[PDB]
Paper text:
The class C Acinetobacter-derived cephalosporinases (ADCs) play a significant role in antibiotic resistance in [name]. β-Lactamase-mediated resistance to β-lactams can be overcome using combination therapy involving a β-lactamase inhibitor coupled with a partner β-lactam antibiotic. X-ray crystal structures of [name] variants in this study provide a structural context for substrate profile differences and show that the inhibitor adopts a similar conformation in all [name] variants, despite small changes near their active sites.
Two of the variants containing an Ala duplication, [name]-33 and [name]-212, begin to diverge in their trajectories starting at Ile209, with the most significant shift in the Cα position (3.4 Å) occurring at the sequence difference between the two: Arg213 in [name]-33 vs Pro213 in [name]-212. In Adup variants [name]-33 and -212, residues Leu216 and Asp217 are extended out from the active site, as compared to [name]-7, -30 and -162. Despite sequence differences at positions 218a and 219 in [name]-33 (Ala218a, Pro219) and [name]-212 (Leu218a, Ala219), the structure is nearly identical, with negligible changes in corresponding Cα positions.
Residue numbers in the entry: 5 to 359
C-alpha cells in the first residue's frame, strides 16, 4: 500500500535537507501508471512551490533527446551513421575531422575531443573554426572520452540533415512526436514564470550559460517532471507512438560498444539487468567520465537490459533510469546539484523494492 510514496519519502526526501536543495521532483512509472512527488520550492525568494509545471535544466540528459533526433533522421535515411560530417556540413569537407563518422561523434570516440570546448569558443563561428583546426590524436573509434563538443557536432549534422536548426528539430519534430508539451530548447515568454534560476553550491541563483548555439545539443534542454515521465514511458512502451518516433527511440537502446560493465548506447548508458548498485555507480566514476577509456566491440549484447543517464548544470541535477523487463522507470529533477552517487543510490533503493 502506497509503496512508491513510502520509498520515495524514505530515499529521496532526506536529500533535500542533507544538501539544502530548494526543490525536488521525483517521478516513478510502474505498469503505465505515473506517480509524481514534489518537495520544496521552485523559487526560495518568491516561496513558489515546485510543481508539475516547474521547468528544470536537464544538463547532459539533453543528450537523450539529441540521440533520439539522430535515431529519427537515421531511420528515415536522412543520414547514415557511417557518414562523416562534411557530407552535411560542407565547410568540414577535406578536414581531418571529416575522417570521424557520425556514430563515433555520437558515442564520444573521435580520439581528440574533451569534455568541453576551450573557454574561448563562445560563438558558433568559433565552433566551426575549432572543428576546421582539429587534428586527430588517438586512433579514431578506439577511445571513449565523454565530450560535449562531440555531441554538439553530431547534433549540428542531424539538424543539417533535417533542413532545420537544432532547436526546431526538437521543438517542431521530436518533442511533438513524443507528446511532450512543456519541453524546450528556448523557453518561451509564456513559460518564464515556470522557469526559475537554479541554485549553485552556495545556494546562489544561477542559470545555465547559453554557450555557442551548437552546445544546445549537449546540454540545452529544459523540461518538467510530467514530460520526463512521458519520455520514460515512450522508452518503455513505444507502441503507443508514431512509427517514425518508435524507430528513433529503438535506435537509442542499441549498445554500440562496451567499457567495463557499461555499454554505450546513443545517449543512454546501458547495463545488463539485474545490475548491482556498484556497476551503476562505476559508470559515474572519474575514470569513466573524465578520462579516455579503450572500448571493446560488443560480442553478444545482454539479453535483458537497463538504462540510465545523469545530467547537471551549475544549478540543477537530473537522473533518469528505466528497466524494460520490470516495466518501471524513475526521474529525479532538482534545482541544486547533488552528488551523482546519491541520485543513483536513491533510485536503486526505490526501483529494487518495487520489482
Amino acid at each position: 500500500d502506497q509503496e512508491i510514496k513510502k520509498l520515495v519519502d524514505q530515499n529521496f526526501k532526506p536529500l533535500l535537507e542533507k544538501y539544502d536543495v530548494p526543490g525536488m521532483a521525483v517521478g516513478v512509472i510502474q505498469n503505465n501508471k505515473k506517480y509524481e512527488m514534489y518537495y520544496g520550492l521552485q523559487s526560495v525568494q518568491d516561496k513558489k512551490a515546485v510543481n508539475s509545471s516547474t521547468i528544470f535544466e536537464l544538463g547532459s540528459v539533453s543528450k537523450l533527446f539529441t540521440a533520439t533526433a539522430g535515431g529519427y533522421a537515421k531511420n528515415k535515411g536522412k543520414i547514415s551513421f557511417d557518414d562523416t560530417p562534411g557530407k552535411y556540413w560542407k565547410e568540414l569537407k577535406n578536414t581531418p575531422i571529416d575522417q570521424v563518422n557520425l556514430l563515433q561523434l555520437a558515442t564520444y570516440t573521435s580520439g581528440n575531443l574533451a569534455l568541453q570546448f576551450p573557454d574561448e569558443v563562445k560563438t558558433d563561428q568559433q565552433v566551426l573554426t575549432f572543428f576546421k583546426d582539429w587534428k586527430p590524436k588517438n586512433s579514431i573509434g578506439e577511445y571513449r572520452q565523454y565530450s560535449n563538443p562531440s555531441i554538439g557536432l553530431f547534433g549540428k549534422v542531424v539538424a543539417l540533415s533535417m533542413n532545420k536548426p537544432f532547436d526546431q528539430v526538437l521543438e517542431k519534430t521530436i518533442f511533438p512526436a513524443l507528446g511532450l508539451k512543456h519541453s524546450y530548447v528556448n523557453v518561451p515568454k509564456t513559460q518564464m514564470q515556470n522557469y526559475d534560476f537554479g541554485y549553485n553550491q552556495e545556494n546562489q541563483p544561477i542559470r545555465v550559460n547559453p554557450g555557442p548555439l551548437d552546445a544546445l545539443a549537449a546540454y540545452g534542454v529544459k523540461s518538467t517532471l510530467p514530460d520526463m515521465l512521458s519520455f520514460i514511458h515512450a522508452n518503455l512502451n513505444p507502441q503507443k507512438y508514431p512509427a517514425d518516433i518508435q524507430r528513433a527511440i529503438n535506435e537509442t537502446h542499441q549498445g554500440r560498444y562496451q567499457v567495463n560493465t557499461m555499454y554505450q548506447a546513443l545517449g543512454w548508458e546501458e547495463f545488463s539487468y539485474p545490475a548491482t548498485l556498484q556497476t551503476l555507480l562505476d559508470s559515474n566514476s572519474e575514470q569513466i567520465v573524465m578520462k579516455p577509456n579503450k572500448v571493446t566491440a560488443i560480442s553478444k549484447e545482454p539479453s535483458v537490459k537497463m538504462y540510465h543517464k545523469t545530467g547537471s548544470t551549475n544549478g540543477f541535477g537530473t537522473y533518469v533510469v528505466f528497466i524494460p523487463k520490470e516495466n518501471i522507470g524513475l526521474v529525479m529533477l532538482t534545482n541544486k546539484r547533488i552528488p551523482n552517487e546519491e541520485r543513483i543510490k536513491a533510485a536503486y533503493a526505490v526501483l529494487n523494492a518495487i520489482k
